Amino acid sequence: ALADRSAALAEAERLKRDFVGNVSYELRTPLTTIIGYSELLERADSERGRNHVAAVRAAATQLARSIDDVLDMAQIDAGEMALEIEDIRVSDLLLNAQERALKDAQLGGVTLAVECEEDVGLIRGDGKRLAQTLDHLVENALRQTPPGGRVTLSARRALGEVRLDVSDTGRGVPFHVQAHIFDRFVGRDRGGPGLGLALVKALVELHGGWVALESEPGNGSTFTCHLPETQ
Amino acid sequence: ALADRSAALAEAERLKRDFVGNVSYELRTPLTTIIGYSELLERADSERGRNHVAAVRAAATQLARSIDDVLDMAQIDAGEMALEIEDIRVSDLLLNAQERALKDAQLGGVTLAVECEEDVGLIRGDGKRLAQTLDHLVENALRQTPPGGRVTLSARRALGEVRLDVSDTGRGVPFHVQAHIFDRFVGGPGLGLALVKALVELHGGWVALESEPGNGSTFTCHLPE
């Protein structure tokens, strides 16, 4: 029918326009920061200059992650992402995520901590995909945490699983967005995670696991990756 | 009701794949360059630092232009770009493109010339989109022209049409790539010439390349009266 064919085309257009509009927002927002701060560098003779460079590098790195997220999410949606399962030492995985984010943490005046015991040992998964999962959770945490705050990376082997936690002393997730926190391009007041948290969920779920958010506006936030043991 | 809705979503997911592909292919080289040179400036005490800034600035401006191209190309592919037809004085259009590119021309040691007769007069079209078309052609010309060379912006009203030419005394395009010169990523930025073709074709026109390998290159916009 005429009305059914019209409604179908309208729905296909709305779903495309929203996707392009969401990806577009993620391209143009870090870009404004890169232009603004690189122009200040051009007209500079230093500590002030260093802060300008750091702001350029952080915005450029965030733009790069958004593009990688769009590509990795499309690969997952097509069912084209297969994991390369191998032995992963959790201790190193946590310390590598801490050193990769250390510069962006000092720029935001935040302390990155690692609280992992020697008894956590080795898990079996995809190193690249688990490193990318932690990276998304740490940068999400740094964006929410104010200067003087703390972001903690912890791991624990208990109840037939390994759980990776990324705690922050930031602003908590308001109740209404807590149910949609792992949805693509979910509207956040402090700053948008884009495809970052949807990717965390998809990557952990590809490992046979699941993700959770424990939050309270005045008591920070905790993101947990529950990874079951393979007997 | 089910087959029509499915075919519509399949077509929209075809558009998505192209957009996502363009985003990845066009933006990642300037981005990596900004990150690498920024990392050097972060761990630096200067003459060397000024070269790092210049590299960050060139990559930043190329990132801005590439993001515009990727977004404009997606809008065109979806059929969501409608032109705002109005009276355009060709003489001003050519001088506007010359003054916007004048700085990048002097940086590359190239001479930017305008050869338009006041007999060309006025044309009908979208001023923003025609200015953007000339900008892409001048950019393309400046990238091909060596220092000491010349890039010319000309216009001519002949045989029931107006033709805008952007000539260059650069390397010249080889005959085998001449037929595919307006194809996306046929070779830096790869949507510029595909955008020129799409914008001129939206104006009811067509584009052409006149090039001799060694002599030069000329890009013409044929806009019918």
Author numbering:
A (entry chain A): 526 to 570, 573 to 758
B (entry chain B): 526 to 570, 573 to 714, 719 to 756
Share the article's original sentences.
This switch is achieved through the activity of the pseudokinase DivL, which activates the CckA-ChpT-CtrA phosphorelay pathway in the uncomplexed state and inhibits this phosphorelay when bound to DivK∼P. DivL has a predicted domain architecture that is typical of many HKs, consisting of multiple PAS domains fused to a C-terminal HK module that contains dimerization and histidine phosphotransfer (DHp) and catalytic and ATP-binding (CA) domains. In contrast to typical HKs, a conserved tyrosine (Tyr550) appears in place of the predicted phosphorylatable histidine throughout DivL homologs in α-proteobacteria, with the exception of the Magnetospirillum magneticum DivL that contains a non-phosphorylatable alanine.
The asymmetric unit contains a DivL dimer, which is consistent with size exclusion chromatography showing dimeric DivL in solution (observed MW = 50±15 kDa, predicted dimer MW = 47.3 kDa). Overall, the DivL structure resembles other characterized HKs, such as the Thermotoga maritima HKs: HK853 and ThkA, although the DivL dimer is asymmetric. Each DivL monomer (DivL-A and DivL-B) consists of a DHp domain with two helices, α1 and α2 (residue range 526–608; since the α1–α2 loop is disordered in the crystal structure we assigned the connectivity of the two DHp helices in each monomer as in other class I HKs), and a C-terminal CA domain with a highly conserved fold (residue range 609–758). The functionally important residue Tyr550 (colored in yellow in Figure 3A and 3B) is located at the middle of the first DHp helix (α1). The CA domains of the DivL dimer are almost identical (RMSD of 0.64 Å for 144 Cα atoms). However, the DHp domains display significant structural differences (RMSD of 3.4 Å for 80 Cα atoms), indicating that the DivL dimer is asymmetric. The structural movements produce an additional contact interface between DHp and CA in DivL-A, resulting in an increase in the buried surface area (1,730 Å2 total) compared to that of DivL-B (1,400 Å2 total).
